[PDB]
mmCIF file of C-alpha atoms and ligand atoms in Angstrom:
data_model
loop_
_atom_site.group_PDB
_atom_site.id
_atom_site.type_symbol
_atom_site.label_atom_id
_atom_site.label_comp_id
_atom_site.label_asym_id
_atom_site.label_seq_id
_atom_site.Cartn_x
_atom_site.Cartn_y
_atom_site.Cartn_z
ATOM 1 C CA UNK A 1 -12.909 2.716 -19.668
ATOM 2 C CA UNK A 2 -11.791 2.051 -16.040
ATOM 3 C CA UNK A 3 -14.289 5.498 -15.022
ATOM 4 C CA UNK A 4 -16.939 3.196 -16.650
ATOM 5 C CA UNK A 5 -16.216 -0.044 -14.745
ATOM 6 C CA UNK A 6 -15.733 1.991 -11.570
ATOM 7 C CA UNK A 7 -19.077 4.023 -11.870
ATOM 8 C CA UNK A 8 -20.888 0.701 -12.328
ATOM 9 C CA UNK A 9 -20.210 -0.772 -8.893
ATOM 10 C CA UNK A 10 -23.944 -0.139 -7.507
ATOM 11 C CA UNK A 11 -24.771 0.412 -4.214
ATOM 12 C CA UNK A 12 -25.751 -3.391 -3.107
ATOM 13 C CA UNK A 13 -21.791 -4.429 -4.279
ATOM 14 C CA UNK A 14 -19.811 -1.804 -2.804
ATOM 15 C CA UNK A 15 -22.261 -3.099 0.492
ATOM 16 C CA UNK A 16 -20.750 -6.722 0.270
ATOM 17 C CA UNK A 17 -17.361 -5.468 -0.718
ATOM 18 C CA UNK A 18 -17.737 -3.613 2.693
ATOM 19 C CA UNK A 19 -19.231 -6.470 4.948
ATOM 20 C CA UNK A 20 -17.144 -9.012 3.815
ATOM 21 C CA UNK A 21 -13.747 -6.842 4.070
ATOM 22 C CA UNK A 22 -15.063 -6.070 7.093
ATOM 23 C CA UNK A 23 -13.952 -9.933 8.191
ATOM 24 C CA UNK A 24 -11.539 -10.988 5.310
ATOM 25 C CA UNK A 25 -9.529 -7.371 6.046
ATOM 26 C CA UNK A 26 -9.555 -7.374 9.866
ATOM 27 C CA UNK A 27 -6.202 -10.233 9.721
ATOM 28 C CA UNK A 28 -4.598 -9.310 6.680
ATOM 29 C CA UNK A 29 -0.683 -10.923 7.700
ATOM 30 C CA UNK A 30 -3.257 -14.324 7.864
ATOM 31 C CA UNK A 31 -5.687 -14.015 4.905
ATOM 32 C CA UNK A 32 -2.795 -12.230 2.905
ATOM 33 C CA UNK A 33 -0.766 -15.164 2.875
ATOM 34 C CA UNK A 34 -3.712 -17.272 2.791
ATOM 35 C CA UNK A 35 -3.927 -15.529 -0.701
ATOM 36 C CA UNK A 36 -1.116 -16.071 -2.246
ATOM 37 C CA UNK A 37 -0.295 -19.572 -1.396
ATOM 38 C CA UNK A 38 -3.601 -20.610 -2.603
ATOM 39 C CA UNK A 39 -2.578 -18.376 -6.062
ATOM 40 C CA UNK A 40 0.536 -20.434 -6.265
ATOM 41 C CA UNK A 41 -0.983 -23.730 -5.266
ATOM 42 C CA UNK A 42 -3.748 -23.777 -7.884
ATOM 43 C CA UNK A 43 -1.888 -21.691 -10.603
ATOM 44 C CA UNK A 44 1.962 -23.123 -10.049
ATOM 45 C CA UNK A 45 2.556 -21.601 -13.736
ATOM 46 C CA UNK A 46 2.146 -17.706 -11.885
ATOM 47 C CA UNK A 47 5.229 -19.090 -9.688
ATOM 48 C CA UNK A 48 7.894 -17.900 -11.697
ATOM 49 C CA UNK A 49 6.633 -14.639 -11.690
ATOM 50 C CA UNK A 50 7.340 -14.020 -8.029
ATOM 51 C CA UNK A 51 11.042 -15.024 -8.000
ATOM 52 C CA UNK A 52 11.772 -12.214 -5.823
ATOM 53 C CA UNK A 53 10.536 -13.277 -2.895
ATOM 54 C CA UNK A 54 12.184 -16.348 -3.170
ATOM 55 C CA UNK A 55 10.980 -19.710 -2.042
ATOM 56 C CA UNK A 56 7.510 -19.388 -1.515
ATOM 57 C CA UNK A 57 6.654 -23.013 -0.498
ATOM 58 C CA UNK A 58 7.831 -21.698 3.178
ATOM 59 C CA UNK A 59 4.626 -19.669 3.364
ATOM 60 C CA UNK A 60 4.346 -17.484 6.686
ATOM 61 C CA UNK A 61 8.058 -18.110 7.368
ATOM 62 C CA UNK A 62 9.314 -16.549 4.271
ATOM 63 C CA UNK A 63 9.953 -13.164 5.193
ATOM 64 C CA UNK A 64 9.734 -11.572 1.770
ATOM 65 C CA UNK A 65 6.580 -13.324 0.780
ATOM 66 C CA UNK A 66 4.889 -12.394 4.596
ATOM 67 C CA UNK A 67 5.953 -8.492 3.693
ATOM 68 C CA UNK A 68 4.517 -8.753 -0.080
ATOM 69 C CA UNK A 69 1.098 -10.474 1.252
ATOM 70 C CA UNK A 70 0.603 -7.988 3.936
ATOM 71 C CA UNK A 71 0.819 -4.955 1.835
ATOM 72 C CA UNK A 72 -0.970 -6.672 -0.961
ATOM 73 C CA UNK A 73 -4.193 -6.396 1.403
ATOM 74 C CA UNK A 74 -3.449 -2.503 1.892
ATOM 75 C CA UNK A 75 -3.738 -1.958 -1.665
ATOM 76 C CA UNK A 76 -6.966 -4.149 -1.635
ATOM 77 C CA UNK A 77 -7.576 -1.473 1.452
ATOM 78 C CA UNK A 78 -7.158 1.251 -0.559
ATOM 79 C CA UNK A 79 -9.512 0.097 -3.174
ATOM 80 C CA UNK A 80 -12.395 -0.169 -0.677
ATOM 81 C CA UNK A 81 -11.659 2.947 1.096
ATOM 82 C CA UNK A 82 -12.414 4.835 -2.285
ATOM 83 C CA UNK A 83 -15.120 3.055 -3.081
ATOM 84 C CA UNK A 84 -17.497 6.110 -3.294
ATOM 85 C CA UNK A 85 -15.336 8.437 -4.836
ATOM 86 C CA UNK A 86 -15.026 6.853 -8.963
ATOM 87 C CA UNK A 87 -12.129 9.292 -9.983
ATOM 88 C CA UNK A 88 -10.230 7.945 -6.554
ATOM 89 C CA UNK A 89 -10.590 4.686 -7.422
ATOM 90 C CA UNK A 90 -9.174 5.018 -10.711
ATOM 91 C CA UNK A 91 -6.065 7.034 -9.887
ATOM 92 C CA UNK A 92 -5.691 4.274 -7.047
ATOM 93 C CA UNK A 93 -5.967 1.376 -9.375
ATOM 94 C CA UNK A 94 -4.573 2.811 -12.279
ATOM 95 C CA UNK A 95 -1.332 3.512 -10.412
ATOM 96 C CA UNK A 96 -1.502 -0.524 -9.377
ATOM 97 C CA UNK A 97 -2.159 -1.454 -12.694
ATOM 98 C CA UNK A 98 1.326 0.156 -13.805
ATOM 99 C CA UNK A 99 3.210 -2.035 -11.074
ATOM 100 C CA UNK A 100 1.444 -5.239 -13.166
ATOM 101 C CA UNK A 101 1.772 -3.839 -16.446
ATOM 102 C CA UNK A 102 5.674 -3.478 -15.975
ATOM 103 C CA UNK A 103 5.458 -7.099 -14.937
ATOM 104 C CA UNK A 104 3.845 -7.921 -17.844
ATOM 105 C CA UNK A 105 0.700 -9.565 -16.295
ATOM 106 C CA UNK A 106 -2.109 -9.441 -18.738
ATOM 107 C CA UNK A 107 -5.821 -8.569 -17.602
ATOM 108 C CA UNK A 108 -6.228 -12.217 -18.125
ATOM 109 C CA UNK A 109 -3.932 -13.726 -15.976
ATOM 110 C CA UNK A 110 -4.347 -10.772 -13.289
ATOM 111 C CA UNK A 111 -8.115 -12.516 -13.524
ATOM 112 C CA UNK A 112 -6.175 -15.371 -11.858
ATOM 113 C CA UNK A 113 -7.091 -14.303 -8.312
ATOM 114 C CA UNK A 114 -10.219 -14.730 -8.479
ATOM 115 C CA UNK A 115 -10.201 -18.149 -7.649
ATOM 116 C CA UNK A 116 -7.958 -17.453 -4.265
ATOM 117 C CA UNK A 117 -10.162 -14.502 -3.655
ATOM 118 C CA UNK A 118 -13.444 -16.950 -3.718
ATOM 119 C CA UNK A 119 -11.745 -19.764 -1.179
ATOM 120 C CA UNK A 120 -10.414 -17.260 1.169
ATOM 121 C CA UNK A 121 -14.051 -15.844 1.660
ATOM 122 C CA UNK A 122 -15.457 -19.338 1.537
ATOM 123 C CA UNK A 123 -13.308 -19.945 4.326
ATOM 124 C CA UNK A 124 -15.082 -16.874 6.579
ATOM 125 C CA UNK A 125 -18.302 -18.276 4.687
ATOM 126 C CA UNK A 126 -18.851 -15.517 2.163
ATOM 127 C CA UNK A 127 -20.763 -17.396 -0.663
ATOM 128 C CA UNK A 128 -20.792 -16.772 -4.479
ATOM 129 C CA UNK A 129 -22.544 -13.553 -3.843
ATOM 130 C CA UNK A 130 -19.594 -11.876 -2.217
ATOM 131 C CA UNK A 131 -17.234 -13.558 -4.963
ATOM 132 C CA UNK A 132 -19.287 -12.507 -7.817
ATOM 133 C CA UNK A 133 -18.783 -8.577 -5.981
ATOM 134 C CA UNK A 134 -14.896 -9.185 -5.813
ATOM 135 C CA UNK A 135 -14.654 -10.282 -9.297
ATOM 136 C CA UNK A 136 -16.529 -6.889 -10.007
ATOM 137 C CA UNK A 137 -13.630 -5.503 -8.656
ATOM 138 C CA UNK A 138 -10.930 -7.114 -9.973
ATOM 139 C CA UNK A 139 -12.617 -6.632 -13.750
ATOM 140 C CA UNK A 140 -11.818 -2.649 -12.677
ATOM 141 C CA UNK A 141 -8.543 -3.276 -12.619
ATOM 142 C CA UNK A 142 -8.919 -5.445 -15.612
ATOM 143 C CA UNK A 143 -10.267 -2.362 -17.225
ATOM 144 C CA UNK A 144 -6.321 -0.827 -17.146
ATOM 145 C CA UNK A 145 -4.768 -4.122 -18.028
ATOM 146 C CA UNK B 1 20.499 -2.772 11.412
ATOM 147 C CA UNK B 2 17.107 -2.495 10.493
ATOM 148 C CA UNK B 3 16.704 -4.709 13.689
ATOM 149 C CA UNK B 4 18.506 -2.486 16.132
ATOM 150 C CA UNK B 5 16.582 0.743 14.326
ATOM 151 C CA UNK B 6 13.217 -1.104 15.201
ATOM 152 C CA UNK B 7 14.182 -1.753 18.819
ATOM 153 C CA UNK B 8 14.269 2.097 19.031
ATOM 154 C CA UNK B 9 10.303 2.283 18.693
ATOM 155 C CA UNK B 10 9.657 2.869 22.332
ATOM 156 C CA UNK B 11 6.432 2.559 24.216
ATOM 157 C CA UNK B 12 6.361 6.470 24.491
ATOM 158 C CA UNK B 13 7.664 6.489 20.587
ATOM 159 C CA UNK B 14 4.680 4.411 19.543
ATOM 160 C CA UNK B 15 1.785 6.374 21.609
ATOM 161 C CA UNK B 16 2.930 9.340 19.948
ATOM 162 C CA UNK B 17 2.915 7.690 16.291
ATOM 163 C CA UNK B 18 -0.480 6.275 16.995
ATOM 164 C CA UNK B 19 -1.845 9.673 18.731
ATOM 165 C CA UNK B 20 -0.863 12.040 15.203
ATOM 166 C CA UNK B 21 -1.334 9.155 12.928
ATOM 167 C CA UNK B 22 -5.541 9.238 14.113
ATOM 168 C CA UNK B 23 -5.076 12.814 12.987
ATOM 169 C CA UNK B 24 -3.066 13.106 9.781
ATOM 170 C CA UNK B 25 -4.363 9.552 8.337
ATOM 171 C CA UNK B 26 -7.755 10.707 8.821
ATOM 172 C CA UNK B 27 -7.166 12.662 5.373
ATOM 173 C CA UNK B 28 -5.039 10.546 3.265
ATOM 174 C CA UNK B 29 -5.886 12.169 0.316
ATOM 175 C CA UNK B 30 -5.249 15.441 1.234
ATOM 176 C CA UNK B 31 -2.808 15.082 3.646
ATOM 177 C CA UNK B 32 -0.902 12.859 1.554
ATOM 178 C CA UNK B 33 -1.031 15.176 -1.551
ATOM 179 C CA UNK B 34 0.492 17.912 0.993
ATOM 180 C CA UNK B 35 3.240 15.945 2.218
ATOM 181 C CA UNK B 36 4.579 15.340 -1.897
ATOM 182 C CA UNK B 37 3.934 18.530 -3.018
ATOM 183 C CA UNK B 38 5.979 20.294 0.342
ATOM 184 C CA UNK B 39 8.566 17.465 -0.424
ATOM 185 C CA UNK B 40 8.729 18.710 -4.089
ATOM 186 C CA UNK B 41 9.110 22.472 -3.765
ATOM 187 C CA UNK B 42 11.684 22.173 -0.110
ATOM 188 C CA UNK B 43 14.144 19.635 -2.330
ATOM 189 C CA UNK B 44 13.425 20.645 -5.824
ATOM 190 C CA UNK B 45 16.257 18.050 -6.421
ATOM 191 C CA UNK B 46 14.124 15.225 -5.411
ATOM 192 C CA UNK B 47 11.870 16.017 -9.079
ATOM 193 C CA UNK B 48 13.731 14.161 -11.580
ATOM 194 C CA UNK B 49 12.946 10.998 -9.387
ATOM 195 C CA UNK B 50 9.551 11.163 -9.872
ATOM 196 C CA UNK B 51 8.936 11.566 -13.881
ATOM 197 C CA UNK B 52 6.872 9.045 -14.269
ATOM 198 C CA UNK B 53 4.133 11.535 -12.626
ATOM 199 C CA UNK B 54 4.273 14.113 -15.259
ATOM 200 C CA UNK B 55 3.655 17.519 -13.988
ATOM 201 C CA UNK B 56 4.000 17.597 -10.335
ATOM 202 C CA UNK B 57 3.311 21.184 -9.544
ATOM 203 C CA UNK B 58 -0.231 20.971 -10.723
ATOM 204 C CA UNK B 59 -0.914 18.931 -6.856
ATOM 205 C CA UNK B 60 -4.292 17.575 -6.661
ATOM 206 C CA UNK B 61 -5.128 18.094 -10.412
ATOM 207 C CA UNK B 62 -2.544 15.597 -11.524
ATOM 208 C CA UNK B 63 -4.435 11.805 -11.305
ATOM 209 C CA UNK B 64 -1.335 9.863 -11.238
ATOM 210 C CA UNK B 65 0.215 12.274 -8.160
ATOM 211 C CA UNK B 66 -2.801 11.892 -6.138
ATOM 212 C CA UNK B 67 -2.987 8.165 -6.647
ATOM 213 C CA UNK B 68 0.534 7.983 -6.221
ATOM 214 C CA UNK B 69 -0.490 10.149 -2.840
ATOM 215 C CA UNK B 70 -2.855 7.892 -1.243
ATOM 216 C CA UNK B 71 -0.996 5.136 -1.749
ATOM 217 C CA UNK B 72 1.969 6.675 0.146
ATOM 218 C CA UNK B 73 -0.299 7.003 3.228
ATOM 219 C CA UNK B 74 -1.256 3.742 2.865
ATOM 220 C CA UNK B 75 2.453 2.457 3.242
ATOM 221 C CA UNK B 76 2.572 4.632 6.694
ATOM 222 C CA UNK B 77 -0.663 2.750 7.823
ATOM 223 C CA UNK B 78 1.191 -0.253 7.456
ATOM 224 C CA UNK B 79 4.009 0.503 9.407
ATOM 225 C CA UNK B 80 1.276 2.127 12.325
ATOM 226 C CA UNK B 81 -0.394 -1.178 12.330
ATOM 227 C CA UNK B 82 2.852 -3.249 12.543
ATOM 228 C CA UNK B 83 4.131 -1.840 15.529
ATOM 229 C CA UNK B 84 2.768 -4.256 17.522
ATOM 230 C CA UNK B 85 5.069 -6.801 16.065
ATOM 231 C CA UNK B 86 8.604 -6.087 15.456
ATOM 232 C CA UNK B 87 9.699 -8.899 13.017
ATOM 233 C CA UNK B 88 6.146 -7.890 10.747
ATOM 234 C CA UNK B 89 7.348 -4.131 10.714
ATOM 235 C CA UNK B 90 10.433 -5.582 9.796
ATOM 236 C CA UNK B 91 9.349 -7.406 6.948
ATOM 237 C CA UNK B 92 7.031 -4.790 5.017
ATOM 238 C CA UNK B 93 9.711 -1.854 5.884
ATOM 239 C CA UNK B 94 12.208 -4.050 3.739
ATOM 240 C CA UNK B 95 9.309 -4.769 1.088
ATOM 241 C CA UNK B 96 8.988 -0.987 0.632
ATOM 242 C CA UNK B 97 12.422 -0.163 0.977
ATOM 243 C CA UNK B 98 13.135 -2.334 -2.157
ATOM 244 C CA UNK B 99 11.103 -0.036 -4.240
ATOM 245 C CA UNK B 100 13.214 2.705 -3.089
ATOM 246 C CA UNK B 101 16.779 1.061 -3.566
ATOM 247 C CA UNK B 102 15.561 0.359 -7.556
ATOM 248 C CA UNK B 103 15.275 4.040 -7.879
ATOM 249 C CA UNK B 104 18.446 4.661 -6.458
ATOM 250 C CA UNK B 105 17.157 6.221 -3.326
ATOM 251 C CA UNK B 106 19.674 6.631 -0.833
ATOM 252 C CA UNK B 107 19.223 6.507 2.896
ATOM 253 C CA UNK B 108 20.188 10.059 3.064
ATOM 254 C CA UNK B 109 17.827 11.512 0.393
ATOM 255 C CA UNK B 110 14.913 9.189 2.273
ATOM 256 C CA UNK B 111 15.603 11.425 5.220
ATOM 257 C CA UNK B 112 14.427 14.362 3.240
ATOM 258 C CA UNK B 113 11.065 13.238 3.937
ATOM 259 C CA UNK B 114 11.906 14.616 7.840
ATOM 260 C CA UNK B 115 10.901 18.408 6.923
ATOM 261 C CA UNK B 116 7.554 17.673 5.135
ATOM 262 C CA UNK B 117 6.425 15.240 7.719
ATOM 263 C CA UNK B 118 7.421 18.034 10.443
ATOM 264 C CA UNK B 119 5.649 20.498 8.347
ATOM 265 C CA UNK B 120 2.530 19.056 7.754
ATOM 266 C CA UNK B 121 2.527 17.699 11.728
ATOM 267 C CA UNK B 122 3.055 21.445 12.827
ATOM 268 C CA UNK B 123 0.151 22.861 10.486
ATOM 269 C CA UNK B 124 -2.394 20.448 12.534
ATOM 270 C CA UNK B 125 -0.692 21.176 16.256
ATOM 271 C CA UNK B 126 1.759 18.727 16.099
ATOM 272 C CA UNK B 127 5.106 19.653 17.204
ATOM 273 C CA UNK B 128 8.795 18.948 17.364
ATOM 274 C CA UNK B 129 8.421 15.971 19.770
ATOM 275 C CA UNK B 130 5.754 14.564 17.250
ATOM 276 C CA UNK B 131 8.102 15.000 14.394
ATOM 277 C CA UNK B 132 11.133 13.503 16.679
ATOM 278 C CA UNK B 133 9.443 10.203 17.054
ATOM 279 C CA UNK B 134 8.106 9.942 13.231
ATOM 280 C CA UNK B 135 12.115 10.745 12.572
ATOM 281 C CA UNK B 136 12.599 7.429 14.061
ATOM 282 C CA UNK B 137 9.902 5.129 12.499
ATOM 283 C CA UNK B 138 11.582 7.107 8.672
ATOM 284 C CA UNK B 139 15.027 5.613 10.637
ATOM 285 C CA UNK B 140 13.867 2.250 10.313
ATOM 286 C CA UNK B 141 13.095 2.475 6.325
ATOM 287 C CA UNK B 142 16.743 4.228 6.052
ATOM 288 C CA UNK B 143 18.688 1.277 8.101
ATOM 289 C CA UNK B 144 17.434 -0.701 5.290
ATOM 290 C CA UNK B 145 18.247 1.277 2.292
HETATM 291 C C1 HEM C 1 -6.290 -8.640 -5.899
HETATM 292 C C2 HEM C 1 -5.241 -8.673 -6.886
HETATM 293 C C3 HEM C 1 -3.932 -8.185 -6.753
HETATM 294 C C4 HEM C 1 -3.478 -7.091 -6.050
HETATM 295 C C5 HEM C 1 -4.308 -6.105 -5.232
HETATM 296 C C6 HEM C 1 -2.044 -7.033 -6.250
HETATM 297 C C7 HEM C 1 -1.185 -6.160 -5.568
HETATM 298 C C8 HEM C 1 0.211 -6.138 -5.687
HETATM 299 C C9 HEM C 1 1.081 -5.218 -4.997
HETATM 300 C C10 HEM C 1 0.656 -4.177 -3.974
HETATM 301 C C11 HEM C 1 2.346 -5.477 -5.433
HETATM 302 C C12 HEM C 1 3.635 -4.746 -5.098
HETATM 303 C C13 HEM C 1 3.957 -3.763 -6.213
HETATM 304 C C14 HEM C 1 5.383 -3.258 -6.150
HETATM 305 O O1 HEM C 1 5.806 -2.826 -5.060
HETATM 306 O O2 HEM C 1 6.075 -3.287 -7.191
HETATM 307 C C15 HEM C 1 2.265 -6.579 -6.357
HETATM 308 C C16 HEM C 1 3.364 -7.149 -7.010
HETATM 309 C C17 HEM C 1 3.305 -8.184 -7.945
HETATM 310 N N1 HEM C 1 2.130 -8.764 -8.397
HETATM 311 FE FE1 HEM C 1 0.250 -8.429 -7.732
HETATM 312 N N2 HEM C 1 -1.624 -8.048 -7.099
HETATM 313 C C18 HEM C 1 -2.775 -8.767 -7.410
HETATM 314 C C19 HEM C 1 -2.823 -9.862 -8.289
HETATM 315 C C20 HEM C 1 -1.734 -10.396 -8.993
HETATM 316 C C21 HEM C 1 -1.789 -11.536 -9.886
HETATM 317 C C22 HEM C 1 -3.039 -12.371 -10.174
HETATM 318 C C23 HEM C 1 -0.521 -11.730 -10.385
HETATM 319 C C24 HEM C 1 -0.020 -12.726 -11.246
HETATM 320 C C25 HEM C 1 -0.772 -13.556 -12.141
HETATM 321 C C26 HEM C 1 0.302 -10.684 -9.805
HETATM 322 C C27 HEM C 1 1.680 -10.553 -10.038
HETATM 323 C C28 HEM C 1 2.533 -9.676 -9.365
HETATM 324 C C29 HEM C 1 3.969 -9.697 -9.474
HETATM 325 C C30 HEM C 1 4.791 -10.613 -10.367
HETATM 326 C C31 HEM C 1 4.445 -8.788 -8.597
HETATM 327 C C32 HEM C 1 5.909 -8.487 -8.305
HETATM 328 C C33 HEM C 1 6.395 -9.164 -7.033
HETATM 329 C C34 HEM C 1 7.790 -8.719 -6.638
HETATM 330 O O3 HEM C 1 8.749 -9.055 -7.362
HETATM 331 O O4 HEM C 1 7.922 -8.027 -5.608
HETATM 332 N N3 HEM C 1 -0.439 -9.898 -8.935
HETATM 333 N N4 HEM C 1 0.947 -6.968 -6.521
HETATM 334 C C1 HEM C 2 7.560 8.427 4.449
HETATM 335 C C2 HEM C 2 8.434 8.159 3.334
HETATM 336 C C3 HEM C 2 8.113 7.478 2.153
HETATM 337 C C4 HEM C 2 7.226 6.444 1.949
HETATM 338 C C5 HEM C 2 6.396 5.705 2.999
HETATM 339 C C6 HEM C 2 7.262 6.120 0.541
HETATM 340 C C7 HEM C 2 6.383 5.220 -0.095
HETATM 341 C C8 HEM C 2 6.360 4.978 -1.467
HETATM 342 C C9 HEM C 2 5.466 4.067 -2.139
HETATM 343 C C10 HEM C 2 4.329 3.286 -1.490
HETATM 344 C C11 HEM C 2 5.806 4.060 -3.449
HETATM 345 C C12 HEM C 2 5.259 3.174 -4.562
HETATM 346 C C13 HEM C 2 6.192 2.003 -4.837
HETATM 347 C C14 HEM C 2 5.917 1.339 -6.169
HETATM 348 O O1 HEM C 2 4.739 1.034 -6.448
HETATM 349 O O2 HEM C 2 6.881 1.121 -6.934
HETATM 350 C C15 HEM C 2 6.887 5.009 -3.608
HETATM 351 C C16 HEM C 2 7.478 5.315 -4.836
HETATM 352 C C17 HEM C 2 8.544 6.185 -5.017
HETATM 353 N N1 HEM C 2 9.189 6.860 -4.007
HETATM 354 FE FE1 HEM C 2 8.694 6.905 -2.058
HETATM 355 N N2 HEM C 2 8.203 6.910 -0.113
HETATM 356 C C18 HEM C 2 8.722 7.750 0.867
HETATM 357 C C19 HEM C 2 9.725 8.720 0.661
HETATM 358 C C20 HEM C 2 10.380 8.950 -0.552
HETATM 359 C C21 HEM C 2 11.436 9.923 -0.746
HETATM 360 C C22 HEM C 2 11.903 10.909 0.327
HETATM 361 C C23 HEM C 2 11.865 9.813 -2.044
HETATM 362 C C24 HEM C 2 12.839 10.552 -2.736
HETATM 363 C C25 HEM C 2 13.858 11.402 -2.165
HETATM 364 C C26 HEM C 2 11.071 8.768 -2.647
HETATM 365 C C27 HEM C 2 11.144 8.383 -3.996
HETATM 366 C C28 HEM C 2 10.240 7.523 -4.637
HETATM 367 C C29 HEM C 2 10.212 7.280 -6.061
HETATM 368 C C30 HEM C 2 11.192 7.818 -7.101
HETATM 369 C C31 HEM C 2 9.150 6.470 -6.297
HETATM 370 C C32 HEM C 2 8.658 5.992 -7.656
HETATM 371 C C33 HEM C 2 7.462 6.779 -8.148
HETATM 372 C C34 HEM C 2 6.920 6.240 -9.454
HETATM 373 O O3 HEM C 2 7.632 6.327 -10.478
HETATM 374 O O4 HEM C 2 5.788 5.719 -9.449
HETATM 375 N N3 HEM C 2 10.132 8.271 -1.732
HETATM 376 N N4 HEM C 2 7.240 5.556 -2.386
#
């Protein structure tokens, strides 16, 4: 269940999840849209998804897509500010899930951050440590996908 | 014009925003939870909106309010850390405001929100000049409905 995959985040991940949202969160207009153009660059078949915010080739420019990115970090906020609290985090990311779910993204393809999530810490050098603790993440939402 | 509502966030406007906001976000959870629930049982009309929650009058107990709850406050930490920057405020309060205008939420029944907001500012020493310049940030999200 997502309770499951939410009480198994130990101790030493929710500590990198911390550190390096410590950095990644602390400029979340930049790293947000750092985000999502790298999702669209390296997965141009999610594109079409996002039609709503129109052209998002225009990046930081695009008004729509600069709003989306920014609160897209606040729900990543959220996540880490329940961190220690497992029924929190699951009313948190279950309610996130639905906003997917109606968008018909699959766990599979929601998996499709992961890469994004791994060059944007690269970037602050967070190594495969702190991506292996994101993806831990990410498979808790997966868990209500 | 969401523009022209914006320019009405004052240097005095935004102290006092940032001043109760280090106060009443300190508790999103609970705080959050109060400021539905009061919204729920001073416009009883407002309920039909929110079905997808189930059973709102059961507060805290019901998962998908609370999560529903934090995530609210998380929305007005947004809009607190964007008031450095008019044309970012500008940009999430029109992200936000789109998932208002697909429920059919009007600016006038947005305004609702005034009472609870003045309620739950008064139960932790707030008062009317507090709720005043919160009436004006809510005036922002309205000019775009
Ligand atoms: C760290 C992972 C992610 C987080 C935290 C996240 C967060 C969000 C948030 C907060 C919204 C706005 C919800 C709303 O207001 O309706 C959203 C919308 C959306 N997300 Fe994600 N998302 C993530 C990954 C993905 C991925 C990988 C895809 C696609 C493969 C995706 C597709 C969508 C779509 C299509 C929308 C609707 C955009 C719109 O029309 O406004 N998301 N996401
Ligand atoms: C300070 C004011 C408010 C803020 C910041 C706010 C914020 C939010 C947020 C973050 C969501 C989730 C959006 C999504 O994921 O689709 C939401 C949903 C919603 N809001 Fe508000 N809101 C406010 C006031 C109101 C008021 C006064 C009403 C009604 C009179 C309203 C009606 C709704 C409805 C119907 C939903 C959908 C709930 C669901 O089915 O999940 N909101 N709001």
């Amino acid at each position: 269940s997502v309770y499951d995959a939410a009480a198994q985040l130990t101790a030493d991940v929710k500590k990198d999840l911390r550190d390096s949202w410590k950095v990644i969160g602390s400029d979340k207009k930049g790293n947000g849209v750092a985000l999502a153009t790298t999702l669209f660059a390296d997965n141009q078949e999610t594109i079409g998804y996002f039609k709503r915010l129109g052209d998002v080739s225009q990046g930081m420019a695009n008004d729509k897509l600069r709003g989306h990115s920014i609160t897209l970090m606040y729900a990543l906020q959220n996540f880490i500010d329940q961190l220690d609290n497992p029924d929190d985090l699951v009313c948190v990311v279950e309610k996130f899930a639905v906003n997917h779910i109606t968008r018909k993204i699959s766990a599979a393809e929601f998996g499709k951050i992961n890469g994004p999530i791994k060059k944007v810490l690269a970037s602050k050098n967070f190594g495969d440590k702190y991506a292996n603790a994101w993806a831990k993440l990410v498979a808790v939402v997966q868990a209500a996908l």
